[PDB]
Coordinates of C-alpha atoms and ligand atoms in Angstrom, one line a residue:
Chain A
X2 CA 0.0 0.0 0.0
X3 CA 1.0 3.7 -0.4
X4 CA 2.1 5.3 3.0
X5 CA 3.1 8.6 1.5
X6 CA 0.5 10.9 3.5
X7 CA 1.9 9.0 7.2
X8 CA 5.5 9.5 6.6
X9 CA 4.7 13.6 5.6
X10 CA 3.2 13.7 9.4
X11 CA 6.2 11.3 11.1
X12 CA 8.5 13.1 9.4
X13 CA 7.4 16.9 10.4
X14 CA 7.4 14.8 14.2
X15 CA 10.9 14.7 13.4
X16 CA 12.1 17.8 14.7
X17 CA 9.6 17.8 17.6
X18 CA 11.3 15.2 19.2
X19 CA 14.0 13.8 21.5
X20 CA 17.3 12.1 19.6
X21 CA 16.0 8.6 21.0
X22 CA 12.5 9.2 19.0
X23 CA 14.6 10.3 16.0
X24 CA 16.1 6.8 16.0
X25 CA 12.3 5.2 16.6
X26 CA 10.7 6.9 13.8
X27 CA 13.6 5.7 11.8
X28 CA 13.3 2.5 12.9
X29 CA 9.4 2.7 12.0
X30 CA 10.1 4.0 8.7
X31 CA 13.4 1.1 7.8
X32 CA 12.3 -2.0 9.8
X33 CA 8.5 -1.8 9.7
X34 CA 7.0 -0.7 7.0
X35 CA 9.2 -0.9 4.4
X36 CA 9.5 -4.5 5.1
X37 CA 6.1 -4.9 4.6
X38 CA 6.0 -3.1 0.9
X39 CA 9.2 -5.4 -0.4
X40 CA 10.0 -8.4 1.7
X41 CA 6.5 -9.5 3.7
X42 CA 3.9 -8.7 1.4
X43 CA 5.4 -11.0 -1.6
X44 CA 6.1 -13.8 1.2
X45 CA 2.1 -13.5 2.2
X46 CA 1.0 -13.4 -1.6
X47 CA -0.3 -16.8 -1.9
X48 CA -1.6 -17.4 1.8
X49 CA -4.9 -18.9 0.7
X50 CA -4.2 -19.2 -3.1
X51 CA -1.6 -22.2 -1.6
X52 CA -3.3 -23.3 1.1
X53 CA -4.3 -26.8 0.7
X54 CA -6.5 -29.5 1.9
X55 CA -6.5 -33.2 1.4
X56 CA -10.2 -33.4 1.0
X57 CA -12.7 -33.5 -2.1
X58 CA -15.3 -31.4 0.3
X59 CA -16.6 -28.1 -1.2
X60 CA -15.9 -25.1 1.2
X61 CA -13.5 -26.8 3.0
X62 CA -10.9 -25.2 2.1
X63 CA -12.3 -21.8 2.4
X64 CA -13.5 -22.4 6.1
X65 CA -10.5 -23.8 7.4
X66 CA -8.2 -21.7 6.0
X67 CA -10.3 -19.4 7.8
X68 CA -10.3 -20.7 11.0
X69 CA -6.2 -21.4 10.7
X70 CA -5.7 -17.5 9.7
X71 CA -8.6 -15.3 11.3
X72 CA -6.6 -12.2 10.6
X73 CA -3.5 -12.5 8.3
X74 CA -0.1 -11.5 9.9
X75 CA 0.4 -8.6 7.2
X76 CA -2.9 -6.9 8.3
X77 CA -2.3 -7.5 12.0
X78 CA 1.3 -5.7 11.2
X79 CA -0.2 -2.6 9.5
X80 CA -2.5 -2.1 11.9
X81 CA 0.0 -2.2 14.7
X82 CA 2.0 0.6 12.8
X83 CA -1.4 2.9 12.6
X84 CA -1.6 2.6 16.3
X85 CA 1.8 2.8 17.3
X86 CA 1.9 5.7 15.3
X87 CA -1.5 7.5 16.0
X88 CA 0.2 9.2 19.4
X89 CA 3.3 10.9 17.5
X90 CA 0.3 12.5 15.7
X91 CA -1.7 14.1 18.4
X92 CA 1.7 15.2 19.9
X93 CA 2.9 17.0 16.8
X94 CA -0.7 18.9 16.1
X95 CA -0.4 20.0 19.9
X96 CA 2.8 21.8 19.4
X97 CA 1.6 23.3 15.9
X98 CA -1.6 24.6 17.4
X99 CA 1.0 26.3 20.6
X100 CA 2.6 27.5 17.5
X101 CA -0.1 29.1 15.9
X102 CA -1.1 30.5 19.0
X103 CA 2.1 31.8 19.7
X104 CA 2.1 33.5 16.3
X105 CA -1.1 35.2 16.9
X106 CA -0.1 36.9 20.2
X149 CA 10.8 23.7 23.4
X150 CA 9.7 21.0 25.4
X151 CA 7.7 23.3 28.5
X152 CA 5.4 22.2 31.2
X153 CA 2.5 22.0 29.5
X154 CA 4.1 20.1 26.4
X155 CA 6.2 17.7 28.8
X156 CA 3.1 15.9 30.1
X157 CA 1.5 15.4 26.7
X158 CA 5.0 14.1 25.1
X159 CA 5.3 11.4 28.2
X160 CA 1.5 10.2 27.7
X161 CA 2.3 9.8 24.2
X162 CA 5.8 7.8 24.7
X163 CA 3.4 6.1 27.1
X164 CA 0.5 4.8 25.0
X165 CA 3.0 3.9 22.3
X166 CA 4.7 1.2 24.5
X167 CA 0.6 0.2 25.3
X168 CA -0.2 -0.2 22.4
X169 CA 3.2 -2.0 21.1
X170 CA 3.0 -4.3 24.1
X171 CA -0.8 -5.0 23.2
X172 CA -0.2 -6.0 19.7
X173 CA 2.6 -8.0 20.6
X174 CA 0.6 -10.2 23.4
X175 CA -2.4 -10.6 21.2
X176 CA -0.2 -11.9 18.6
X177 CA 1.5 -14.1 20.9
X178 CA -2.0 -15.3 22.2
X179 CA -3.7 -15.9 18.4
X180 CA -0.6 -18.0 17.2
X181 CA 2.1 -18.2 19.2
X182 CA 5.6 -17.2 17.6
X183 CA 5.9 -20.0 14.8
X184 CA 3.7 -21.0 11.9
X185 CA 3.4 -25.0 11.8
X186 CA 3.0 -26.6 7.9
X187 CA 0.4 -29.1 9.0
X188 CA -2.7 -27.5 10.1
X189 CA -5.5 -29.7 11.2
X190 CA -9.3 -28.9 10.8
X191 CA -12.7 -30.0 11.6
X192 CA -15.1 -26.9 10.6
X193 CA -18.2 -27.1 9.1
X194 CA -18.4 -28.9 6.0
X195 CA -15.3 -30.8 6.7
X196 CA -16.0 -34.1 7.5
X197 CA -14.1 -35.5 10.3
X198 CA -10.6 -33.7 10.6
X199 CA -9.1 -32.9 7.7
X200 CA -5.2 -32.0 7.1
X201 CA -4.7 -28.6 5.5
X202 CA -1.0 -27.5 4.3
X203 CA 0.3 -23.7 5.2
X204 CA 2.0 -21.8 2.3
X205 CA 6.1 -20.7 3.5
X206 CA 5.7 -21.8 6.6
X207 CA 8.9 -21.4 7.4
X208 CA 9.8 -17.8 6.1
X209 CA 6.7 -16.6 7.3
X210 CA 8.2 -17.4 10.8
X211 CA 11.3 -16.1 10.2
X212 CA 9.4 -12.6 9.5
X213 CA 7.4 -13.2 12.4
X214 CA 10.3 -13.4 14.4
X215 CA 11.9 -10.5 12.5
X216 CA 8.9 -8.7 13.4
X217 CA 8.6 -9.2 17.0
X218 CA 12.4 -8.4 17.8
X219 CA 11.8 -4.7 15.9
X220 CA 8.5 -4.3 18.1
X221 CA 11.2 -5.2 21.6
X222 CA 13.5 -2.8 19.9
X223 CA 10.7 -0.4 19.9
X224 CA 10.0 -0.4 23.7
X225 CA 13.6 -0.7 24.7
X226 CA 13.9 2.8 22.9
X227 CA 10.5 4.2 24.4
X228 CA 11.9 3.2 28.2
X229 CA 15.2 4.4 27.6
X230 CA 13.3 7.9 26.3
X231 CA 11.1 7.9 29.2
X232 CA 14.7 7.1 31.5
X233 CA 15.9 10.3 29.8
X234 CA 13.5 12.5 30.1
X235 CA 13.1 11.8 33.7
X236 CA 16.8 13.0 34.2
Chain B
X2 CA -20.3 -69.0 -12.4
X3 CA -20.8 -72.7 -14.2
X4 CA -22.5 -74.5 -11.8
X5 CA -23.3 -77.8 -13.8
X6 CA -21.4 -80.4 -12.3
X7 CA -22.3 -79.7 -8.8
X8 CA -25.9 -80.1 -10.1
X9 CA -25.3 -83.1 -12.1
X10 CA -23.9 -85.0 -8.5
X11 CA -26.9 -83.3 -6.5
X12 CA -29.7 -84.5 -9.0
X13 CA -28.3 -88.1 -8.6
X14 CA -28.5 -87.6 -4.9
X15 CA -32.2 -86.8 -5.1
X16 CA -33.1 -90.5 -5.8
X17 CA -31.2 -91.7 -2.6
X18 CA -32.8 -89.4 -0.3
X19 CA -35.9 -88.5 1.9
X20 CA -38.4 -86.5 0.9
X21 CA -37.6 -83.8 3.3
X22 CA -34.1 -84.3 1.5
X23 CA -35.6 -83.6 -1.7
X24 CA -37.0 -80.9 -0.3
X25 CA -33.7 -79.3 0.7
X26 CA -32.2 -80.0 -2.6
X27 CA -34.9 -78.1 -4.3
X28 CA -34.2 -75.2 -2.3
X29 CA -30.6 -75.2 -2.2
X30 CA -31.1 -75.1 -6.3
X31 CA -33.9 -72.4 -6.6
X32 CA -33.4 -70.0 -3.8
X33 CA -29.2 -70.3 -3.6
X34 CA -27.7 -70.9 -6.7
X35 CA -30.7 -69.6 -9.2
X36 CA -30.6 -66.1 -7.3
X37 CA -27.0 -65.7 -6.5
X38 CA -26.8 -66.2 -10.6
X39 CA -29.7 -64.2 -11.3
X40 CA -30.1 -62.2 -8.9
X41 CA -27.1 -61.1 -6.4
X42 CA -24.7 -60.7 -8.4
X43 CA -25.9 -58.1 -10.6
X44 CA -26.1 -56.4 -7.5
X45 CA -22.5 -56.9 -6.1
X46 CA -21.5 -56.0 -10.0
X47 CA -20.1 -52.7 -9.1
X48 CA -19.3 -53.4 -5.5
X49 CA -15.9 -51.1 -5.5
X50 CA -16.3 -50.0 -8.8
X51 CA -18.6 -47.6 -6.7
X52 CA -17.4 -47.5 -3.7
X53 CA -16.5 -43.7 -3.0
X54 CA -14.3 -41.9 -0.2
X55 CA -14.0 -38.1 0.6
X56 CA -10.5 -37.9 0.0
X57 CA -7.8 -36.8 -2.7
X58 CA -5.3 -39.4 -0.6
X59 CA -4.3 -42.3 -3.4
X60 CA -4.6 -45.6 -2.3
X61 CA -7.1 -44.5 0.5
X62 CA -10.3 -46.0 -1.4
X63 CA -8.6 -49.7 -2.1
X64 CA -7.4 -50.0 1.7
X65 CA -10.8 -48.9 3.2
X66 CA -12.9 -50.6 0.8
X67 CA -10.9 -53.7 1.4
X68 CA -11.2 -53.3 5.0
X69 CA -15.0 -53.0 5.0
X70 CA -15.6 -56.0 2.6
X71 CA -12.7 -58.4 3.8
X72 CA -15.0 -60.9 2.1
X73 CA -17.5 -60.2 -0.7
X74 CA -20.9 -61.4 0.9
X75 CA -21.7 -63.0 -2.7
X76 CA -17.8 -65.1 -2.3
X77 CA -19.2 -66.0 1.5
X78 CA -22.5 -67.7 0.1
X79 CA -20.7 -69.5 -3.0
X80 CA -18.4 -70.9 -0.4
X81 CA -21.6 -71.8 2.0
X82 CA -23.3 -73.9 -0.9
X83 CA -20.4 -75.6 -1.4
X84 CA -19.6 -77.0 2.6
X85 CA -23.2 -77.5 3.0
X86 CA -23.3 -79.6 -0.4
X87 CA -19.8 -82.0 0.3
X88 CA -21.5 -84.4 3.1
X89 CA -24.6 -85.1 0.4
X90 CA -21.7 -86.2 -1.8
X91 CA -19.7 -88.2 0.4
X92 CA -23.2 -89.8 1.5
X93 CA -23.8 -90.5 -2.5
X94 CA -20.2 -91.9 -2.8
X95 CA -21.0 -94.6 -0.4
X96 CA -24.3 -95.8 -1.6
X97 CA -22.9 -96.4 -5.1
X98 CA -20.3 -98.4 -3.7
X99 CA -22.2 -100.6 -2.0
X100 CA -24.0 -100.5 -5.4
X101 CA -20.8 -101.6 -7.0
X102 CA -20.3 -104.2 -4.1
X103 CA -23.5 -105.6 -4.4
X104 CA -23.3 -106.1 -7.8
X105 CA -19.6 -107.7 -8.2
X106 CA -20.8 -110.4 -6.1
X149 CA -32.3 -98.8 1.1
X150 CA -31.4 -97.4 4.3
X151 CA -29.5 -100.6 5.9
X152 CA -28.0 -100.6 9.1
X153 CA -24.9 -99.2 7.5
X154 CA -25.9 -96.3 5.6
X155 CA -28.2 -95.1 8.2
X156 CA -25.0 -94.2 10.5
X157 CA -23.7 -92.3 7.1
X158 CA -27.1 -90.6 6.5
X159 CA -27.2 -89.5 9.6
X160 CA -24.0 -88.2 10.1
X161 CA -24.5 -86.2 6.6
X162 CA -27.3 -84.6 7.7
X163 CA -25.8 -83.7 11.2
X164 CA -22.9 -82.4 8.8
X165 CA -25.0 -80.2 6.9
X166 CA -26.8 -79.2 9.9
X167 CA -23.0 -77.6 11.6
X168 CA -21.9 -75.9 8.4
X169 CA -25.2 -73.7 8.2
X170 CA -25.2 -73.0 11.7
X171 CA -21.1 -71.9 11.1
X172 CA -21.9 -70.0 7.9
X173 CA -24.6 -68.3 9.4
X174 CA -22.8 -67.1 12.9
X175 CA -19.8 -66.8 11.1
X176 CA -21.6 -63.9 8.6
X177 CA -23.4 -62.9 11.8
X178 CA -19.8 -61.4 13.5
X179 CA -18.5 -60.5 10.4
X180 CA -20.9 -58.0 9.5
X181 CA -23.9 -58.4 11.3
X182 CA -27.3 -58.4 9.0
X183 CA -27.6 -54.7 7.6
X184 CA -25.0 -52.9 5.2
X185 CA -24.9 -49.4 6.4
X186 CA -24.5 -46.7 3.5
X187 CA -21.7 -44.6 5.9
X188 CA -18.1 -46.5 6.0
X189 CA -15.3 -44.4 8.3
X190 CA -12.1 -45.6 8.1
X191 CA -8.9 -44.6 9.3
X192 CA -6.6 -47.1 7.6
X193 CA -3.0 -46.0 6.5
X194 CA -2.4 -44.1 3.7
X195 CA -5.6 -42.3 4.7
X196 CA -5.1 -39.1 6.5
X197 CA -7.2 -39.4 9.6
X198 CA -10.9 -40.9 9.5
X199 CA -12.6 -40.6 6.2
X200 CA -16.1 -41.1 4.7
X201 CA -16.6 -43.8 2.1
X202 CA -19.6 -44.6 1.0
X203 CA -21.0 -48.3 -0.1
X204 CA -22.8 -49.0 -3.3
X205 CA -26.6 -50.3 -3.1
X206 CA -26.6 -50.7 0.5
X207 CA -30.8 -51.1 1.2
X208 CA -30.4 -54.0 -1.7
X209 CA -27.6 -55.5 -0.5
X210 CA -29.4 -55.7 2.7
X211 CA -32.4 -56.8 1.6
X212 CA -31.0 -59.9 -0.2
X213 CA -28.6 -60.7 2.9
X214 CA -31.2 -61.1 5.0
X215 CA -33.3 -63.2 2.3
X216 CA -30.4 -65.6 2.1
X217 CA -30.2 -65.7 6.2
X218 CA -34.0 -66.5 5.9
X219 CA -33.5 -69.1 3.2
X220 CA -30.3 -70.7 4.8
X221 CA -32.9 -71.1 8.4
X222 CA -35.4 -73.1 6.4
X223 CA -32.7 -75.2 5.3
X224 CA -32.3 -75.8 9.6
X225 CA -35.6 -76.3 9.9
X226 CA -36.0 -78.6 6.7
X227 CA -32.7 -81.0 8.3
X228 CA -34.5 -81.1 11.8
X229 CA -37.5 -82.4 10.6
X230 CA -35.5 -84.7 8.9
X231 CA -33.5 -85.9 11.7
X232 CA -36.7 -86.2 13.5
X233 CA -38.1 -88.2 10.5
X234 CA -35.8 -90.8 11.1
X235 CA -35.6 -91.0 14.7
X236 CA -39.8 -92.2 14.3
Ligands
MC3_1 C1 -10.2 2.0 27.8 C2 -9.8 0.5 27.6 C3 -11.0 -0.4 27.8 C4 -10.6 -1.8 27.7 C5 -11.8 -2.8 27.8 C6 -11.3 -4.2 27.6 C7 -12.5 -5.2 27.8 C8 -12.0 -6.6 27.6 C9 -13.2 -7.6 27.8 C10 -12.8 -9.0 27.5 C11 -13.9 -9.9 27.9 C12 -13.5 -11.4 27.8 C13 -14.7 -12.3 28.4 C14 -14.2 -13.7 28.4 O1 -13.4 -14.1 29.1 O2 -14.9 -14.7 27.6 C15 -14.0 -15.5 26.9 C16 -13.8 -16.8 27.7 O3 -12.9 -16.5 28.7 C17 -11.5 -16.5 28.3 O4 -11.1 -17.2 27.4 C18 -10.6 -15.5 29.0 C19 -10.3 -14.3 28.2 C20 -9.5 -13.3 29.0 C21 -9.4 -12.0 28.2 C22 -8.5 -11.0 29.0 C23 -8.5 -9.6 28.3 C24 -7.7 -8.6 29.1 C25 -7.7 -7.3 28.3 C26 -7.0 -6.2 29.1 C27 -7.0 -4.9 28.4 C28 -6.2 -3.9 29.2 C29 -6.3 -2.5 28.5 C30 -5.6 -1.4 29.4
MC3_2 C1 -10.0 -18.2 19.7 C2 -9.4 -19.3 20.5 O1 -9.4 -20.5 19.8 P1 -8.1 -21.4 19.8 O2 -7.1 -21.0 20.8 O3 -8.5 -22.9 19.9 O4 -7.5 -21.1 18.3 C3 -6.2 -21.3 18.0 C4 -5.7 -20.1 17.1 N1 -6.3 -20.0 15.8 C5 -7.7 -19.6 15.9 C6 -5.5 -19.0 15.0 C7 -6.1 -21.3 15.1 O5 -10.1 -17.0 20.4 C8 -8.9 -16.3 20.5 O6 -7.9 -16.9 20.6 C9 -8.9 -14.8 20.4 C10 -7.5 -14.2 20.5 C11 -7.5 -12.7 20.5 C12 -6.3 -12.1 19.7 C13 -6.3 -10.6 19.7 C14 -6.4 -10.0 21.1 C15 -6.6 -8.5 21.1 C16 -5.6 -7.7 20.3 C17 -5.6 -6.3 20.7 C18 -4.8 -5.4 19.8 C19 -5.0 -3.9 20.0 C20 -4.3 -3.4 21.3 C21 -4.0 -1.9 21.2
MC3_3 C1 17.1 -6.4 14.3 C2 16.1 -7.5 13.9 C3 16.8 -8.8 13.9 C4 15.9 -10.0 14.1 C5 16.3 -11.2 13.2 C6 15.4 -12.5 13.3 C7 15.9 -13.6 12.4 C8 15.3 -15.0 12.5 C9 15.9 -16.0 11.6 C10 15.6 -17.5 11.8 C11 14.3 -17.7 12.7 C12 13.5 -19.0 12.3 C13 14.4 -20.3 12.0 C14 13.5 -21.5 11.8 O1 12.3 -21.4 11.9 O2 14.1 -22.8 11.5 C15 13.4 -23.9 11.9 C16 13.7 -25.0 10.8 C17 13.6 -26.5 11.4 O3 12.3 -26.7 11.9 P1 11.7 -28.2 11.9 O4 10.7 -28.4 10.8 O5 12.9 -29.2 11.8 O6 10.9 -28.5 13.3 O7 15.1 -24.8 10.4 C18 15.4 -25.6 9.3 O8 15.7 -26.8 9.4 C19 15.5 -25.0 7.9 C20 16.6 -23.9 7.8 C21 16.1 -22.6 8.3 C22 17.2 -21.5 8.3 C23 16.6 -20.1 8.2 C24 17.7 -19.1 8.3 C25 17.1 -17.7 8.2 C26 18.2 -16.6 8.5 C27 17.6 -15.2 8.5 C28 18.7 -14.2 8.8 C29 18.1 -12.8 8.9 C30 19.1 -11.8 9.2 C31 18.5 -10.4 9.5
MC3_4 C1 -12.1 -80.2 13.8 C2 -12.6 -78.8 14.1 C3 -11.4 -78.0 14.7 C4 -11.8 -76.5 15.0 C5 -10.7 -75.7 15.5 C6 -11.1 -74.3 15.8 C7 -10.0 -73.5 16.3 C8 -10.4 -72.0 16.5 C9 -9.3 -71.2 17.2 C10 -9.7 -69.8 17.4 C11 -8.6 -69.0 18.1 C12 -9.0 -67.6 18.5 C13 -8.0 -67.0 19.4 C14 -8.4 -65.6 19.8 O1 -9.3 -65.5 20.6 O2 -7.7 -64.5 19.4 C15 -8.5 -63.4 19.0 C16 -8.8 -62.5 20.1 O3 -9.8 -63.1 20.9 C17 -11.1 -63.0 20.5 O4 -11.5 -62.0 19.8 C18 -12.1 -64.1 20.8 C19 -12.3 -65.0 19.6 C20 -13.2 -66.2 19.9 C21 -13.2 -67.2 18.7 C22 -14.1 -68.4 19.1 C23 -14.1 -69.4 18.0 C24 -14.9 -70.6 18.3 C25 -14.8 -71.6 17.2 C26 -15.6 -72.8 17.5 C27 -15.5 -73.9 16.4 C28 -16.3 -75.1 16.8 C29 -16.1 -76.2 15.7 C30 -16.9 -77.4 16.1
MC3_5 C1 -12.0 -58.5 12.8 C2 -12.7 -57.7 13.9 O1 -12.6 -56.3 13.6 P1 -14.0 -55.4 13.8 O2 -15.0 -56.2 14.6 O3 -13.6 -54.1 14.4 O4 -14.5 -55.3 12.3 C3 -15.8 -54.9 11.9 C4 -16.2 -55.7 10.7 N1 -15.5 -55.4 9.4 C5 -14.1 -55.8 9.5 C6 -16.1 -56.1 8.3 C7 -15.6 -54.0 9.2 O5 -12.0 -59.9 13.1 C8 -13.2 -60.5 12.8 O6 -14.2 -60.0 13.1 C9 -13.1 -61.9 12.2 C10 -14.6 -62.5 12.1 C11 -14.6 -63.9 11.5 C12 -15.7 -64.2 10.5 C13 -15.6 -65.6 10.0 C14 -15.7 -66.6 11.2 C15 -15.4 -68.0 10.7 C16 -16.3 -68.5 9.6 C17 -16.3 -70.0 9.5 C18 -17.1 -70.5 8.3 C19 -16.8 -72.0 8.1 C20 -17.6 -72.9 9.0 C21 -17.9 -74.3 8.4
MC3_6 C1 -38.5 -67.5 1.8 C2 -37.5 -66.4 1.9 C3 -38.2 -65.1 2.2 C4 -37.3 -64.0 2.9 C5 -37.7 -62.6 2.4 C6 -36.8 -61.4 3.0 C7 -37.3 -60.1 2.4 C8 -36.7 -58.9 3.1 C9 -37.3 -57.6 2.5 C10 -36.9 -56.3 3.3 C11 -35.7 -56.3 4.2 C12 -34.9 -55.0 4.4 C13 -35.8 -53.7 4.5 C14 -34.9 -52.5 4.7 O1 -33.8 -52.6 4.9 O2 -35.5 -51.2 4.8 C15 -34.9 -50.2 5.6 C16 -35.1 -48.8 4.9 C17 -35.0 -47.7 6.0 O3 -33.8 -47.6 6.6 P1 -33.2 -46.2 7.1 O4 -32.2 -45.7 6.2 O5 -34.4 -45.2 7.3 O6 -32.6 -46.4 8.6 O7 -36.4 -48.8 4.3 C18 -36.7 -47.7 3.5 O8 -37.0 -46.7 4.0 C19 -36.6 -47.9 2.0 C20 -37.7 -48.8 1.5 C21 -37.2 -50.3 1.6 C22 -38.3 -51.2 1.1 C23 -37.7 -52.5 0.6 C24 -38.8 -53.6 0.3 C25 -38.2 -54.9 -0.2 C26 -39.3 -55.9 -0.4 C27 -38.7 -57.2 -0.8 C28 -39.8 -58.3 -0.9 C29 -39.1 -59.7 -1.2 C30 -40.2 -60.7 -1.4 C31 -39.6 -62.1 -1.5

């Protein structure tokens, strides 16, 4: 997908912004979603065009490769960027609109306590993402993927699609989220000396 | 099949015989051999030419046909007529030996024993045949098969070709083969008076 119109606003949070969330919105911008575009996407391609059941069943194969992947891991991923970056937004359009009303007439007292809730709900929302996605399929994507959802009959055996590399990207993934709130502590560490 | 010589050696039994004896021979021709001919075997034609599983797993229809029919019921009956036809035979064999004897030189004190002992014979064989199709598969042919025989990938579905017919005629032949009981009792009985 095109991210143009995010990375405008990330970028202008740029320069409002401590030297350790210079290096996050980097990291954002390298590890995250450009990953997605070139390496993740392609890998995710065929998720249900390659998905396979040994079964002669109509609709199988559409409800258990529903039931294996509620959510795909490429949407779950863009919607953990959105979130994680929503805050950065609200923080910037604070300081423009102390701009402007400067104008009509850095980091101060009344600015300090929005940045911090905002370096806050970041690491809420990172950890939250990165539990649910612990909790819906653990850290590693298994080829053989057993079903018995309606029509099925019995339990049938369903084969996953790059099972292998898509666990190497989750794993990719996950480390870049811990990188993530390692940075947001060590921010919050600073700030409070 | 060609069942002719059987018949021929049966039809010179008929003279040297009771009339309940006659009786039975009747019946074994007309309701055994005629319908299996006929009839039954029409029917058990396409036996696993139609047998069907839910499955794309090769191999998985010949092992789980094979292990619902072990035995074709219509193999089972050719078989039956056979055992219960031998002891008529060897009771045939005899009196025309004493034919022979009597001749180089009815029911006497000698063949009585052999009589006897044929029909007691005849008597164990269709009491085997029918318990032994009894355990095997009970009296009724179910249309559902599941089977989880290796190569097939958990339990599957098969499904069984002309099962209400199948089961009609099974227990026709379990009703036929019980007269033939009845018919050597009475026969037994017979002689004791
Ligand atoms: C302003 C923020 C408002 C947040 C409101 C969150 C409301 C979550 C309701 C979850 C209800 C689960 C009911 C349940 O249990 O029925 C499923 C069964 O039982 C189970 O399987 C156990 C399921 C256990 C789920 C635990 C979810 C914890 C969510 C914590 C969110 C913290 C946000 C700060
Ligand atoms: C279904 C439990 O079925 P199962 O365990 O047998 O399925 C095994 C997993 N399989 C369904 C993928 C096969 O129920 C679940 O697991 C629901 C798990 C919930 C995952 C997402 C949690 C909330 C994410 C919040 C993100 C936003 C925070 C800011
Ligand atoms: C700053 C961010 C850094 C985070 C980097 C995370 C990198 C994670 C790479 C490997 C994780 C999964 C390995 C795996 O899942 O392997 C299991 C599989 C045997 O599993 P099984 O079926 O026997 O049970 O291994 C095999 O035998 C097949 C061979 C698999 C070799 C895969 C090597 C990938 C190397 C990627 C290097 C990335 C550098 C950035
Ligand atoms: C001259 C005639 C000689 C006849 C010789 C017959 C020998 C039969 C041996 C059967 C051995 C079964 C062993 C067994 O049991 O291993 C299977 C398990 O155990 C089970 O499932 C229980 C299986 C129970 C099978 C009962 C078979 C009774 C056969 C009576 C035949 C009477 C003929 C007059
Ligand atoms: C297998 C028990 O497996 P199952 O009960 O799970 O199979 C269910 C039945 N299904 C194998 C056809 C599916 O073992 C058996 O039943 C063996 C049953 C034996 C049937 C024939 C007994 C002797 C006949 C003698 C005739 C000659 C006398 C003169
Ligand atoms: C001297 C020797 C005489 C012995 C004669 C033995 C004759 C046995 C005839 C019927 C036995 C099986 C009936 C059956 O197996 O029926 C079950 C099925 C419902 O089973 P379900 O799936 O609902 O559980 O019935 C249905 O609904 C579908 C309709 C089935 C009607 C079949 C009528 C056959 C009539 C044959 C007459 C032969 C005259 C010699």
């Amino acid at each position: 997908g095109d991210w143009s119109f995010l990375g405008n606003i990330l970028e202008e949070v740029n320069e409002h912004s401590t030297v350790i969330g210079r290096v996050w919105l980097t990291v954002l911008f390298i590890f995250r979603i450009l990953i997605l575009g070139t390496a993740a996407e392609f890998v995710w391609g065929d998720e249900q065009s390659d998905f396979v059941c040994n079964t002669q069943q109509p609709g199988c194969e559409n409800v258990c490769y529903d039931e294996a992947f509620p959510i795909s891991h490429i949407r779950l991923w863009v919607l953990q960027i959105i979130f994680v970056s929503t805050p950065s937004l609200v923080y910037v359009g604070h300081a423009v609109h102390h701009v402007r009303m400067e104008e009509k007439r850095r980091l101060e007292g009344t600015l300090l306590r929005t940045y911090v809730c905002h370096i806050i709900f970041k690491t809420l929302f990172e950890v939250g993402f990165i539990v649910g996605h612990y909790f819906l399929y653990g850290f590693r994507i298994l080829p053989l993927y057993r079903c018995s959802r309606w029509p099925c009959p019995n339990v049938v055996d369903c084969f996953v699609s790059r099972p292998t590399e898509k666990t190497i990207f989750i794993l990719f993934m996950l480390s870049v989220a811990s990188v993530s709130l390692f940075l947001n502590i060590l921010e919050m560490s600073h700030l409070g000396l």
